[PDB]
């Protein structure tokens, strides 16, 4: 009703959990951002017909997206904003919280809609990530680990890859990362512009 479906978080972070610098992400990875795009927009061939995915983001991340690239295409965009100062858009929603956002979609994309909702992704930032991390429906984290201690001023709020969260969060086999993303993806380290990174999938039991 409020939330029927599971939520998925997607992030690119350093080994120190740094995610941004100056209202921007501190690196330029074309193949990396390409991955974000195919994950956040992939719906099965048959479900391909009606279905669109949803990306939920906090106000600042909204602003941090290149003007040329937003709203993020082929996805339903929703910005979480308490203030709701300006909630502009030609078909893009606003919502007071994560729960409010879930209910607006269920309401907007019910049976009286052509286009049905497939998967829901939280794309950040840190404040929205903190809220998702405490949501009873978030069970999966699509993370990109960047093996470089790049200077950041914003951090991922929970050390899910640390020993203290190891009985809760588990890293999945690559084979099931590829099955969930539905495309094959590069295994192990990837080098692009001097940075080494890797794709991972973590899951927790609800």
Angstrom distance (rounded) from CA 87 to CA 56: 14
Structure tokens at 57: 């983001």
Residue 102 makes CB contacts below 8 A (sequence gap 6+) with: 2, 3, 120
The piece of 80-88, 101-109, 159-167, 175-183 that touches ligand NAP (CB under 6 A) is 80-88
Question: Is 104 an interacting residue with respect to ligand FOL (CB under 6 A)?
Answer: no
The piece of 18-26, 66-74, 109-117, 183-191 that touches ligand NAP (CB under 6 A) is 18-26
Q: Is 23 helix (H, G, I), strand (E, B) or coil?
A: coil
Angstrom distance (rounded) from CA 95 to CA 160: 27
Site for ligand FOL, residues 118 to 137, rule: CB under 6 A:
123-124
**Cα angle: 41, vertex 168, 35; to 5 degrees:** 20
Kind plus residue range of the DSSP H or E element containing 126: helix 126-133
Question: Is 144 an interacting residue with respect to ligand FOL (CB under 6 A)?
Answer: yes
Task: State in angstroms the smallest separation of the CB of 82 from ligand NAP.
Answer: 3
Please state, in angstroms and as integers, the Cα–Cα distance from residue 43 to each residue in 52, 120, 125, 148, 202, following that order: 7, 11, 24, 32, 20
From 7, 9, 13, 25, active-site residue: 25
Tell me which residue has tokens 């050390």.
159
Task: Flag whether 114 is marked binding.
Answer: no
Measured from the CB atom, the residue of 37 and 103 that comes closer to ligand FOL is 37
Task: Flag whether 119 is marked binding.
Answer: no
Show the site string, 21-50: x = touches ligand NAP by CB under 6 A, - = not.
--xxx-------------------------
What are the backbone angles phi and psi of residue 129, rounded to the nearest 5°? Answer: -70, -35
The piece of 69-77, 84-92, 93-101, 179-187 that touches ligand FOL (CB under 6 A) is 69-77
- Residue numbering of the annotated binding site: 12, 18-24, 32-37, 59-61, 75, 81-83, 124-131
Q: Which residues bind ligand NAP (CB under 6 A)?
A: 11-13, 19-20, 23-25, 58-61, 64, 80-83, 97-98, 123-128, 131, 154
């Amino acid at each position: 009703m409020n939330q029927q479906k599971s939520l998925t978080l997607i992030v690119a972070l350093t080994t120190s959990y740094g995610i941004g610098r100056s209202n921007s992400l501190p690196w330029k990875l074309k193949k990396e951002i390409s991955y974000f795009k195919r994950v956040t927009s992939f719906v099965p061939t048959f479900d391909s017909f009606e279905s669109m995915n949803v990306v939920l983001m906090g106000r600042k991340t909204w602003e941090s997206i290149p003007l040329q690239f937003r709203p993020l295409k082929g996805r339903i965009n929703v910005v979480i904003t308490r203030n709701e100062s300006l909630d502009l858009g030609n078909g893009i929603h606003s919502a007071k919280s994560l729960d409010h956002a879930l209910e607006l979609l269920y309401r907007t994309y019910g049976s009286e809609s052509s286009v049905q909702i497939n998967r829901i992704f939280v794309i950040g930032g840190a404040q929205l990530y903190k809220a998702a991390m405490d949501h009873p429906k978030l069970d999966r984290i699509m993370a990109t680990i960047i093996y470089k201690d790049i200077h950041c001023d914003v951090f991922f709020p929970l050390k899910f890859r640390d020993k203290e969260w190891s009985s809760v969060w588990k890293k999945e086999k690559h084979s099931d990362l590829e099955s969930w993303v539905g495309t094959k993806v590069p295994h192990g380290k990837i080098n692009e512009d001097g940075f080494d990174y890797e794709f991972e999938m973590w899951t927790r039991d609800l």
